[PDB]
Amino acid sequence: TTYADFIASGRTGRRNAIHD
Amino acid sequence: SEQESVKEFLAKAKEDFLKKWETPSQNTAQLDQFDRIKTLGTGSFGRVMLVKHKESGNHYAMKILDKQKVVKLKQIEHTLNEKRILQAVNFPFLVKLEFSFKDNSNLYMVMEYVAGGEMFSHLRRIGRFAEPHARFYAAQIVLTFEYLHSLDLIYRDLKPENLLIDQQGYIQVTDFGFAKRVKGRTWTLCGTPEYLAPEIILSKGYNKAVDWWALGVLIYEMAAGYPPFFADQPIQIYEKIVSGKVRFPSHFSSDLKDLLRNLLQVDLTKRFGNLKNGVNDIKNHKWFATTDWIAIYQRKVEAPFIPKFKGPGDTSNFDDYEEEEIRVSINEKCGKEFTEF
Ligand SMILES: CCCCCCCC
């Protein structure tokens, strides 16, 4: 499932902003 | 009739804002006046701490930016914007800036403490919000952007990590680090990968419309429990974003999918919020047929969820961070650069 895919991904934690 | 009261309200709001906008507050406190309790969060250039004001006994959240680090990451203009704007705004769903000041090494912004924690925490915990629950949050965002946009302000950093839940279950937007006042187009590459509009990624020059796209991402993420464009590396995210293909989970209502397909519209010229009816096309959407905007604004609606608060100064709703002692140099650092702060 997609949810399961998200859960295993590297981006489940807090996401920082980019600027450059 | 309803539209006219808004227009008037907004009008009066623009006047108050301009007054503060032109003559910003400055050096309203000193480090010595507070006790540092705990780090509530971490961001890209500085940190946020739970603090206590010696004289009054109230707690606040204090944002700390290191002047030199700000300088190295080219965020000077952004930092001046953030403070100048926060001090001028006033809306029920925005964090109130209490005090601001600086010292040899840093910049400080002190705001009201919002104990409920980040929307992000709960969402991830619960996994996903029920539509009505999400609609309740989205509504607040709609009105907020309505306010902000009317002031020529662009937000640029919407994401659950930036929405705090208050004692009453309502949302408080924090982190104005990328907020900008601009009449016209803007070109900076800033935001959070998952939430970036295609025009930003495509280096095309953008306006207030990026905020609406972001609102689309937020709503999908709240209801599905995962963003519409996810991957492990940013580059892959940007590729999915640009591509213009969205899939919806089987549980989304037809209404929701409609709202979403219109918000997540790759073509600015077709994107809701960026058309003749402006915000109205959104507020008028069938998905929000049930919402009493006024009541939301008034905070008369019952919140679907209320975080648990065990005492003033309780940090239960926030994650734990490693403590780093703040150091104030003997030498003034980057004075010139932050004169106006
Ligand atoms: C007295 C009700 C005014 C409505 C507020 C509008 C928010 C943008």
Rounded Cα distance between B266 and B280, Å, is 20
Given a contact cutoff of 8 angstroms between Cβ atoms, the answer to whether B10 and B19 are in contact is: no
Cβ contacts below 8 Å, chain A against chain B, sum to 54
Residue B299 tokens read as 């905070």
Q: Helix, strand, or coil here: B37?
A: strand
Rounded Cα distance between B176 and B58, Å, is 23
**Per DSSP, which regions of chain B are E strands?**
34-42, 46-53, 59-66, 97-102, 106-112, 153-154, 163-165, 171-173, 180-181
Q: Helix, strand, or coil here: B32?
A: helix
* Nearest C-alpha neighbor of B259 from the set B135, B119, B160, B120: B135
Rounded Cα distance between B81 and B62, Å, is 17
Mutate to test the pocket of ligand 1, among B9, B298, B300 (most ligand atoms within 8 A of CB): B9
Rounded Cα distance between B313 and B6, Å, is 36
Å from CA of B6 to ligand 1 middle:
5
Chain A residues with CB inside 8 Å of B238's CB? none
Q: Helix, strand, or coil here: B46?
A: strand
* Amino acid at residue number B279: V
Å from CA of B2 to ligand 1 middle:
9
* Amino acid at residue number B185: R
Which DSSP category does B171 fall into?
A: E
The CATH number of B24-117+309-341 is which of 3.30.565.10, 3.30.420.10, 3.30.200.20, 3.40.50.150?
3.30.200.20
Chain B residues with CB inside 8 Å of A20's CB? 73-74, 189
Which DSSP category does B59 fall into?
A: E
- B189–A19 C-beta distance less than 8 A: yes
- B232–A17 C-beta distance less than 8 A: no
* Amino acid at residue number B288: F
Task: Give the pairing type, strands B34-42 and B163-165.
Answer: unpaired
Do B2-23+118-308 and B24-117+309-341 have matching folds? no
B301 annotated as ligand-binding: no
Say how many Å lie between the first and final Cα of chain A, rounded: 33
Please give the torsion angle defined by the CA atoms of residues B65, B67, B70 and B76, in that order, rounded to the nearest 10 degrees. 110
Residue B106 forms beta bridges with which residues?
B66
Chain B residues with CB inside 8 Å of A9's CB? 230-232
The domain ranges of chain B are 2-23+118-308, 24-117+309-341
Residue B167 tokens read as 């004692």
Residues with CB under 6 A from ligand 1: B 5-6, 9-10, 143, 146-147, 294, 297
- Contacts of B257 by beta carbon, 8 Å cutoff, 6+ apart: B248
Q: Would you state the CATH architecture of domain B2-23+118-308?
A: Orthogonal Bundle (1.10)
Å from CA of B152 to ligand 1 middle:
17
Give the resolution to one decimal, in Å: 2.0
Q: Helix, strand, or coil here: B169?
A: coil
CA distance A9 to chain B (A): 6
Rounded Cα distance between B49 and B220, Å, is 30
